Design a protein around this ligand. Structure first.
Ligand SMILES: Nc1ncnc2c1ncn2[C@@H]1O[C@@H](COP(=O)(O)OP(=O)(O)O)[C@@H](O)[C@H]1O
Ligand SMILES: Nc1ncnc2c1ncn2[C@@H]1O[C@@H](COP(=O)(O)OP(=O)(O)O)[C@H](O)[C@H]1O
Ligand SMILES: Nc1ncnc2c1ncn2[C@@H]1O[C@H](COP(=O)(O)OP(=O)(O)O)[C@H](O)[C@H]1O
Ligand code: BEF
Ligand code: BEF
Ligand code: BEF
Lengths: 525, 544, 509
């Protein structure tokens, strides 16, 4: 016996349709799933969640743009707000959480507006007209004196909040190393040069910053290498140190005895010839970047010359920018206008590992520096380099004028905005009023999210901040380490301005895409 | 290896692994219902793996639906259902105390303490603990006013908590007002309680108590009156099963020469009706059998306008007849020779009206000769709730009974369990040495409850409990009153408050039977170090 | 054995599962709520808007979702009209009460906060009250008729219903004494309403066709007996030791059969309705008394004829009485074409009321009675409780603007609860507008202003343009309904809000 409903309109294999309103209710929740997971991650007094790669590797972070980096999602809608955080971490270092936090919330609050009666087009224009007002209003809500960049004074003041956010409790010591490695780059400046090298052993507090990069490698030439010098002049070059090998087809042919009896010698000749030539130039150290020849290595060890094995093509550069020399293909023909002076090239060992270094400069002073991070856990030492790269990106923005404009972070601004955005919609006729009063309360995230982190009764923290519009700066925030509501001004806690603007935009941009789509046709397999 | 015996299916764990597996198995069944207790606590839903659900906050019933795998866990389930027998409430909590006692006890032998020392460290701390109850419960003999408080405290941490004050009295009044018996010179309230039903649909608050029983039945024939009220009504609880009559077995019927098969065919029915009338002739306002009336014997009880109910609940016609003064008749014959019936068998009520309650109707019996009849007819949204509402009832009615059957009561709300905490450790530690560390854990294990009463609230409550400490420790020590102690937790609003000043109050009995059995369970497992578990009987699976 | 989801991570899956069921009822609302063809098992196939049947034949896996689909029939029995609405309210009641769970302190502060809601709201639901005369009920009974496929003939039914209600006829009318035959064919206006009982009972007297087709002034005897050679209840066995005691026994058979009807004709009977069939012998001995006889009548049926006719059903004819025979005007077995049917009506002061319908296929007819019941019942609701409410979602918007008023006038952290309950009641009319839009949203604020200083009544029309005024419009829902629909809607949510863990197995142990 029957029955069975036929299929209205067929298609290929299998495809998934989604009624737009239903999808919005349904996909607005998918979005909401990764929200409650990103809430607890943002801010210092929060939490970090472990993640096990599809390859088995273990990863722990506070950063939400990385949580998703290691996360394999399926939801085409969630895919968006993930593309957001990720499409920001690259352009701007910090602020990756305020992305998701807002984005998610924007969608969350928009629901009410979508259910009330509004339409997606109406909701979009609503939010949009707020993104233009929230971006500008902030351009003046600053009041934070755009401090000029010099030494470690202004740096440590900015670089701390960027760090104290996830790696809370080591804010002071941490950022110290950051600003340290920074001030070794004579001020347009490149962020990439400051590389980081972490090595197991001891507690993190025993880390150090050396003017120059560190190599987890031993000096070639065996027991014939010095591995210890004083103020030696170096000369780095790519071309293989060994004999001049035929890049194209090439071999060795001999016809008569005289040929053979001498061919063996000829090599030895050229070898020593090439070497001594470069040695006489006063070259105290040859940093091989590509290829090493034992045949001719015979020479270099005897006079008393170092030899750093062939690093990566990309690591030779950042190295050279430390020495002062310059790379040069083909062996021989050294140019003193291409030579560089290196302070010390000793062979120290941390954690019991043979290592060579460029630490300290009398001296010429390196243009690139590296941080040596000692630790006890592979995982932590990794989510420390992150809290560092965040910082290295904060100094990347302050270095490009006039982004060096401070701003009341710690929720302060993210709270004042609540009212400032309300007024706009409070005095704008039309149905768009609602769509604005929502975008406003959307910023309830940062406030509450901080409170809920510390066990603070959220029902008190919010009201307190509202009363404290003080407008002193503000001047008004919440520190998990006190009573009631804290004062941003005091702690010297302020989040860089431009980062917030980027966050407030990328979210309002992404949240709009999710709102904009009506039907999702997902495939299979 | 081994050889030992015997595998497979038969194995044994030794010392550490067991003492652990036992503790884990206990925290398991424990930690599930560790959220339930406390007003801040919630209910749960259990799935009959066939879709069917069941929402409940009761700890006892909740653990039963769990299935209790393992000896250690099921041992707690067994300890649970014990509590209902003692009391009726606190099943959710008793399990916790026990579990915590093991948890800590083992955490001591894990410190190479040795069980014997511990098993005594409780053995003593327990006796002294009750010796402290002698100071707390006594002052709670004098304090209908404080009976509605106990019935109300049995509402919180429950669904009917929202309508506490309302049902608080519906509970008290039926037992206090209409539910008293007397057997062998003893006065007690129904430990088997008073009929309670459920009305699908309707308002929450509007659950109708009744000035009489609520026999859940429908009129035999539609031709009968749906109600017979006024006053002085003729009730008859007849378990005679006056339906029909077939030959007494073993008494075959072989006829001849007649032509008389008919002369007794009707005679088989006659003797039936003859007894039916003999009873109808003494009153017959309402007839209530257990076996049931027959169509050919209803017409007779119908024409006389006598309400007849086919096959009632035997457990009812008893309680009903006991109040109307009637006499649940078994067999017709009364001495010899007797038919028989006497108007002295019938009952005394006021109204016998068959009410209606949403696509359903039940006959009520209002007013009685002896004024002892109560039936609370609940009414809510779904069976899913109307049932659980009853659980809060069966579990609250009890708290009162136990109370009214023992003058001594106790300031609950984490109060008692707090005083002991401070009192034994500060004052029990006279023996010292190693035995001290045992007593200590026995007291510390008591905080387990006050703790969870707080942790149930998402907010940081680590401090709210810390205060309950200093406060209670204040009664004596350290370094004419007014006694500043006897306070308790106000889960609803943070910070301490005197519990006696509040409706909160738990029967002393409950605080004892639960404190005591929680120990025996713990002990019995402490003595364990090896669990030989032999496989059952496998299917033949014979290759031949 | 199995896992379990607990905490907010699950508290949610409870709520969004609730909203889920209501989502399938938004279309159904009175105005243009479109019928839903639901194919079910075994081979059942229904179609309509009656919640407690559109959901009934629709199974649900989740616990919460299973609690909602229960309130449907949990409500239909109590009043029997708030089918579609109670679900739509119960659900939306949590949606606008959810963000106050996490942002709110606890799930229990919201509990107490809901009592002050239902209490106050039931009050406001009583303010808009109307009085029923007890003709004019035809005014209210029109509304039950209006949503379903009864509007085309809104009039015809309203009368056919208040009439059936009128016959019985007791302070409380039990629709168990109001049979509803449903003949296929003819015209929907052909659905008469006999004042007796209609039977598929073919030409009674299966012996021969001699029994009268119909009789004027019939004196009926309705029996639950068998009317056939009775067998010894006490297991008896025969022993024919004689030589011709066999013929004498054979006689004792036909004998008792005659003696049977002998004492039944003494009541001057001319027509008998026996629940059980009759033996051919006893089918003839009485047949010579020109008396009709119909057997196989249903147990319930012979109770409808018990009030119509007036005679009391009696067993064992020997003790028969004059008070057992009845007085009914006629018994004509007219053919419904190809299929017979014995009709029996008349008798003064008779409770029974069998309202045979007509129209289209057996399925069409079904949905007719399906909604007819919604009518028949809706009038008893108003009859047992003579007072009505301002329908059209007006009543809803009222308790919404009233609670809303109580909102600000509350000093506490649990304020965000009463608020929720309010906001959710506004949604009751919401779809009324969304089912006839676009658009529902603009009209919302219109009622808010009117309620504030526009007097209690005045809601949304289902015509529909938009705003109107129900007292003027003529849509008054019996308070009894709206009362319990709101109550059913709020309490179930409260039980469900009390839940924070879900275990996925049972002992039952
Ligand atoms: N006293 C404080 N000092 C620095 N940051 C604070 C302080 N109090 C709260 N915070 C929070 O820490 C930062 C945000 O956390 P974070 O995980 O870094 O988000 P994101 O990296 O996306 O900006 C601040 O902008 C602020 O919201
Ligand atoms: N209002 C209260 N505040 C703090 N503790 C209470 C309060 N009421 C009762 N308690 C204590 O904690 C309770 C835990 O609930 P419980 O009775 O074990 O489960 P249920 O009440 O559902 O049967 C106790 O009954 C009691 O001693
Ligand atoms: N035309 C209408 N406009 C607004 N409300 C109406 C209208 N008609 C009826 N109602 C009320 O709304 C109620 C709720 O719907 P319900 O009867 O339970 O299911 P349905 O409306 O689909 O038949 C009733 O139908 C009625 O009391
Ligand atoms: F969350 Be931020 F980007 F560290
Ligand atoms: F403790 Be109660 F009886 F669940
Ligand atoms: F669903 Be409606 F009441 F016909």
């Amino acid at each position: 016996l029957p029955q069975n409903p036929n299929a209205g309109l067929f298609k290929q294999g299998y495809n998934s349709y989604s009624n737009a309103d239903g999808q919005i209710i349904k996909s607005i929740a998918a979005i909401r799933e990764l929200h409650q997971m990103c809430l607890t991650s943002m801010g210092p007094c929060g939490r970090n969640k472990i993640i096990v790669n599809h390859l088995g590797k273990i990863i722990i972070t506070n950063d939400a743009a990385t949580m998703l980096r290691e996360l394999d999602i399926v939801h085409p809608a969630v895919k968006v707000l993930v593309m957001a955080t990720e499409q920001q971490k690259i352009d701007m270092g910090d602020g990756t959480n305020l992305v998701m936090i807002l984005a998610g919330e924007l969608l969350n609050v928009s629901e009410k507006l979508i259910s009330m009666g509004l339409s997606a087009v109406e909701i979009i224009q609503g939010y949009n007209m707020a993104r233009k007002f929230t971006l500008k209003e902030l351009d003046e809500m600053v009041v934070g004196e755009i401090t000029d960049k010099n030494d470690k004074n202004e740096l440590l003041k900015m670089i701390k909040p960027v760090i104290s956010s996830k790696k809370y409790g080591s804010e002071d010591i941490l950022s110290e190393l950051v600003s340290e490695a920074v001030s070794h780059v004579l001020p347009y400046f490149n962020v990439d040069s400051i590389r980081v090298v972490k090595i197991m052993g001891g507690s993190l507090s025993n880390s150090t910053v050396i003017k120059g990069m560190v190599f987890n490698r031993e000096p070639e030439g065996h027991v014939k290498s010095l591995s210890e010098d004083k103020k030696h002049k170096v000369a780095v070059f790519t071309c293989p140190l060994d004999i001049a090998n035929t890049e194209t087809k090439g071999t060795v042919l001999l016809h008569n005895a005289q040929e053979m009896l001498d061919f063996s010698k000829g090599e030895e000749k050229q070898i020593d010839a090439m070497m001594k030539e470069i040695a006489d130039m006063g070259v105290e150290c040859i940093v091989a970047g590509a290829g090493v020849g034992e045949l001719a290595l015979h020479y270099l060890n005897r006079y008393g010359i170092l030899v750093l094995k062939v690093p990566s093509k990309f690591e030779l550069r950042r190295l050279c920018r430390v020495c002062g020399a310059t790379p040069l293909p083909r062996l021989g023909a050294p140019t003193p206008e291409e030579l560089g002076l290196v302070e010390t090239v000793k062979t120290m060992e941390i954690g019991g590992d043979r290592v060579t270094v460029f630490k300290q400069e009398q001296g010429e002073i390196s243009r690139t520096s590296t941080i040596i991070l000692r630790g006890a856990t592979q995982n932590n030492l990794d989510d420390i380099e992150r809290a560092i790269d965040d910082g290295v990106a904060a100094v990347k923005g302050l270095m490009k004028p006039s982004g060096g404009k401070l701003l009341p972070g710690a929720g302060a601004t993210e709270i004042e905005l609540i009212s400032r955005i309300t007024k706009y919609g409070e005095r704008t006729p039309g149905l768009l009023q609602l769509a604005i009063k929502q975008f406003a309360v959307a910023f309830e995230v940062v406030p509450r999210t901080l409170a809920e982190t510390a066990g603070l009764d959220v029902n008190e923290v919010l009201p307190n901040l509202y009363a404290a519009h003080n407008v002193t700066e503000p001047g008004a925030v919440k520190t998990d380490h006190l009573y009631k509501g804290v004062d941003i001004d005091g702690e010297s806690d302020e989040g860089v301005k431009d980062i917030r603007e980027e966050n407030i935009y990328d979210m309002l941009a992404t949240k709009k895409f999710a709102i904009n789509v009506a039907t999702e046709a997902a495939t299979t397999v | 290896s081994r050889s030992d015996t015997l595998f497979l299916g038969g194995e044994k764990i030794s010392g550490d692994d067991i003492r652990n597996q036992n503790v884990l198995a206990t925290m398991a069944v424990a930690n599930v219902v560790k959220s339930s207790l406390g007003p801040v606590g919630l209910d749960k839903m259990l799935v009959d793996d066939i879709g069917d659900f069941t929402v409940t906050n009761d700890g006892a019933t909740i653990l039963s639906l769990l299935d209790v795998q393992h000896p250690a866990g099921k041992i707690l389930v067994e300890l649970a259902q014990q509590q209902d027998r003692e009391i009726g409430d606190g099943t959710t909590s008793v399990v916790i105390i026990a579990s915590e006692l093991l948890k800590r006890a083992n955490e001591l032998v894990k410190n190479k303490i040795h069980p014997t020392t511990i098993i005594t460290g409780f053995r003593v701390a327990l006796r002294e603990a009750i010796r402290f109850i002698n100071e707390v419960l006594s002052t709670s003999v004098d304090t209908k006013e404080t009976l509605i408080n106990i019935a109300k405290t049995s509402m919180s941490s429950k669904i009917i908590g929202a309508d506490s004050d309302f049902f608080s009295n519906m509970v008290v009044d039926a037992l206090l007002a209409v539910k008293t018996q007397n057997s062998k010179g003893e006065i007690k309230y129904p430990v088997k309680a008073v009929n309670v039903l459920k009305a699908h649909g309707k308002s929450a608050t509007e659950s109708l108590l009744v000035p009489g029983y609520a026999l859940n039945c429908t009129v035999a024939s539609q031709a009968m009156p749906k109600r017979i009220a006024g006053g002085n009504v003729k009730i008859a609880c007849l378990d005679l099963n006056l339906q029909k009559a077939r030959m007494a077995m073993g008494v075959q019927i072989n006829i001849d020469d007649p032509e008389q098969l008919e002369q007794i065919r009707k005679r088989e029915a006659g003797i039936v009706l003859e007894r039916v009338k003999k009873i109808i002739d003494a009153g017959a306002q309402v007839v209530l059998t257990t076996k049931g009336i027959d169509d050919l014997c209803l017409k007779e009880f119908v024409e006389a306008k006598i309400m007849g109910v086919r096959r009632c609940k035997k457990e009812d016609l008893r309680r009903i007849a006991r109040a109307t003064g009637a006499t649940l008749v078994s067999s017709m014959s009364n001495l010899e020779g007797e038919e028989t019936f006497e108007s002295s068998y019938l009952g005394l009520c006021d109204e016998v009206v068959q009410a209606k309650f949403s696509d359903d109707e039940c006959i009520l019996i209002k007013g009685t000769s002896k004024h002892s009849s109560s039936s609370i007819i609940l009414r809510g949204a779904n069976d899913y709730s109307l049932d659980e509402m009853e659980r809060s009832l069966h579990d609250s009615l009890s708290v009162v009974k136990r109370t009214l059957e023992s003058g001594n009561v106790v300031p609950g709300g984490g109060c008692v369990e707090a005083a002991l905490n401070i009192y034994l450790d500060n004052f029990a530690t006279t023996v010292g040495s190693r035995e001290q560390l045992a007593i200590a854990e026995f007291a510390a294990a008591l905080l387990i409850i006050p703790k969870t009463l707080a942790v149930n609230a998402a907010k940081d409550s680590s401090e709210l409990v810390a205060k309950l400490r200093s406060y209670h420790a204040a009664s004596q020590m350290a370094k004419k009153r007014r006694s500043y102690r006897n306070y308790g937790l106000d889960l609803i609003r943070g910070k301490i408050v005197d519990e006696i000043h509040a409706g909160v109050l738990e029967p002393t009995i409950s605080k004892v039977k639960s404190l005591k059995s929680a120990l025996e369970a713990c002990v019995a497992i402490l003595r364990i170090d090896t669990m030989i578990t032999v496989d059952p009987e496998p299917p033949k699976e014979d290759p031949h | 054995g199995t896992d379990a989801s607990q905490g907010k991570g699950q508290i949610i899956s409870n709520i969004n599962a609730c909203v889920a069921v209501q989502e399938a009822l938004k279309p159904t609302l009175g105005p243009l709520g479109s019928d839903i063809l639901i194919v079910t098992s075994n081979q059942k196939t229904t179609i309509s808007n009656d919640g407690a049947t559109i959901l009934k034949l629709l199974d649900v896996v989740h616990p919460a979702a299973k609690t909602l689909v229960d309130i449907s029939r949990a409500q239909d029995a109590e009043v029997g009209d708030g089918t579609t609405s109670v679900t739509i309210l119960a659900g939306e009641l949590m949606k606008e009460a959810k963000p106050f769970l996490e942002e709110g302190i606890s799930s229990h502060l919201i509990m107490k906060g809901y009592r002050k809601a239902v209490s106050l709201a039931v009050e406001k639901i009583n303010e808009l009250a109307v009085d029923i005369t007890s003709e004019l009920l035809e005014r209210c009974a029109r509304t039950a008729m209006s949503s379903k496929l009864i509007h085309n003939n809104a009039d015809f039914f309203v009368k056919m219903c208040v009439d059936a209600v009128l016959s019985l006829d007791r302070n409380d009318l039990d629709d168990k004494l109001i049979g509803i035959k449903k003949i296929p064919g003819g015209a929907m206006e052909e659905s008469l309403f006999i004042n007796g009982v209609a039977f598929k009972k073919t030409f009674s007297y299966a012996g021969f066709e001699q029994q009268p087709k119909k009789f004027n002034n019939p004196k009926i005897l309705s029996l639950n007996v068998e009317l056939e050679l009775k067998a010894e209840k006490d297991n008896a066995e025969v022993r024919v030791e004689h030589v011709e005691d066999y013929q004498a026994i054979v006689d004792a058979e036909w004998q008792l059969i005659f003696e049977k009807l002998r004492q039944v004709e003494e009541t001057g009977a001319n027509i008998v309705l026996s629940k059980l069939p009759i033996g051919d012998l006893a089918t003839q001995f009485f047949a010579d008394r020109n008396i009709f006889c119909a057997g196989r009548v249903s147990a319930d049926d012979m109770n409808r004829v018990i009030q119509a006719v007036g005679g009391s059903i009696q067993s064992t004819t020997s003790d028969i009485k004059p008070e057992h025979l009845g007085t009914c005007a006629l018994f004509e077995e007219m053919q419904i074409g190809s299929e017979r049917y014995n009709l029996f009506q008349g008798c003064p002061q008779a409770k029974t009321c069998t309202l045979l319908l007509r129209g289209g296929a057996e399925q069409v007819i079904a949905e007719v009675e399906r909604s007819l019941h919604d009518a028949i019942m809706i009038v008893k609701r108003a009859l047992q409780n003579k007072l009505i409410v301002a329908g059209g979602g007006a009543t809803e918007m009222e308790v919404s603007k009233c609670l809303r008023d109580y909102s600000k006038t509350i000093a506490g952290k649990q304020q965000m609860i009463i608020n929720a309950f309010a906001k959710a009641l506004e949604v009751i009319p919401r779809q009324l507008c969304e089912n006839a839009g676009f658009d529902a949203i603009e009209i919302l604020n219109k009622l808010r202003l009117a309620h504030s200083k526009g007097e209690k009544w005045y809601g949304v029309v289902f015509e529909t343009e938009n705003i109107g005024d129900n007292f003027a419009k003529f849509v008054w829902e019996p308070a009894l309904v709206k009362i319990n629909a709101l109550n059913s809607a709020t309490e179930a949510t409260n039980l469900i809000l009390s839940v924070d863990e879900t275990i996925t197995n049972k002992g039952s142990e």
